Amino acid sequence: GDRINTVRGPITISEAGFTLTHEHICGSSAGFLRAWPEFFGSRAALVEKAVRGLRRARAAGVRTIVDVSTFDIGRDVSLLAEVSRAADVHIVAATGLWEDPPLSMRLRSVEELTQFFLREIQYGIEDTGIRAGIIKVATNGKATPFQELVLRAAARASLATGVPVTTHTAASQRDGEQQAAIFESEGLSPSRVCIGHSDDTDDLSYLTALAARGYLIGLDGIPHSAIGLEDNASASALLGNRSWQTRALLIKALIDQGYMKQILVSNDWLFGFSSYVTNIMDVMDSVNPDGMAFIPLRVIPFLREKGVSQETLAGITVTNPARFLSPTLRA
């Protein structure tokens, strides 16, 4: 309630400022950057690209990003700390598990997983001493048996520490409904949970049913769109064919329904991406050259033109992330 853990140590709530709540320095796999840095050109090339991108985001007003890369996204907190220092942008790191856990995770019990998540929140990630400030989980449709354990362990870790949970969904399958059911069965307050990738759907009944019971709604992929690349099957499968304007208008829709305090907005951008097809990063950068600066440079002015106030947008980009991230059992 007074401090948020970043990769450079605790910061005060007021220090977080304008915060992107779902981003990645690098979307990869555990051990991969260490074993095959040439996949990204070089580790130094990846660092340089990330620092340039974060510096441009800072110039556009961003002060903090939440890197929601887990163990199995290949989160490298030493890389995050290096990039954070060079760009003067706070980075909050994550624990949890995404959609690609290895056997040594997939075989674990709910108690074992809770110990692992608590390790990364309360003690440190690997031998770095850097502590996670958020817990990331994932489903893609109906939860697998192991994913049910992950969601329950995430709830237990959050209940012990006050650190929030943020989720990956297949939004068009309404995953948030089952995620909410499992979280609530463990006693977790919806005020500690962001149901993410929720801008992947236009179903207002699904989105308002989550918001009505107190969940935060992660509209976190605004620039993801393959409009202009129908020839590219893999880019279309990843990014979808809805426009960024269509995604951004969901922010206005939820404001107009009274949920402005529960909206979290982000780009879900990356500076490297080995867990998808080769050269996807080049395709993505062609779609959105602004990178993580897309939200402040393009989405905020778009919503202002559509009649959203500056005050409301400041509440969504500053006040809501601080309330979400500040450790508490009830926000």
Ligand X SMILES: *[C@H]1CC[C@@](C)(CC)CC1
Interface with Zn ion (CB under 5 A), residue from 77, 268, 269, 296: 268
Stretch that binds its own copies, among 25-33, 148-156, 157-165, 285-293 (CB under 8 A): 25-33
Phi/psi class of residue 103: alpha, beta or left (left: φ > 0; alpha: ψ in -120 to 50)? Answer: alpha
What is the smallest separation between the CB atom of 132 and its own copies, expressed in angstroms? 11
For its own copies, give the closer residue by CB, 158 or 274.
274
How do beta strands 64-67 and 19-23 pair?
parallel
For its own copies, give the closer residue by CB, 98 or 259.
98
3-state secondary structure of 262: helix
Is 224 assigned a ligand-binding role in the annotation?
A: no
Residue 262 lies near ligand X (rule: CB under 6 A)? no
168 binds, among ligand X, its own copies, Zn ion, none (CB under 5 to 8 A by kind): Zn ion
Cβ(24)–Cβ(73) under 8 Å? yes
Output DSSP code: residue 153. H
Is 268 assigned a ligand-binding role in the annotation?
A: yes
List the beta bridge partners of residue 273. Answer: 27
3-state secondary structure of 94: strand
What is the smallest separation between the CB atom of 271 and Zn ion, expressed in angstroms? 13
Nearest alpha carbon to residue 87 among 112, 60, 114? 60
For ligand X, give the closer residue by CB, 43 or 252.
252
Give the integer Cα–Cα distance in Å for 133 and 10.
9
Residue 275 lies near its own copies (rule: CB under 8 A)? yes
Is 127 assigned a ligand-binding role in the annotation?
A: no
Residue 168 lies near Zn ion (rule: CB under 5 A)? yes
Q: What residues between 177 and 196 interact with its own copies by CB under 8 A? A: none
Residue 136 lies near Zn ion (rule: CB under 5 A)? no
Residue 257 lies near ligand X (rule: CB under 6 A)? no
Residue 312 lies near ligand X (rule: CB under 6 A)? yes
Q: What residues between 231 and 270 interact with its own copies by CB under 8 A? A: none
- Which residues are part of a known binding site for Zn(2+)? 22, 24, 136, 168, 197, 268
Binding site for ligand X (CB under 6 A): 255, 308-309, 311-312
Chain residues binding its own copies by CB under 8 A are 28-32, 34-36, 38-39, 71-72, 74, 100, 102-105, 107-109, 112, 115-116, 119-120, 125-127, 274-278
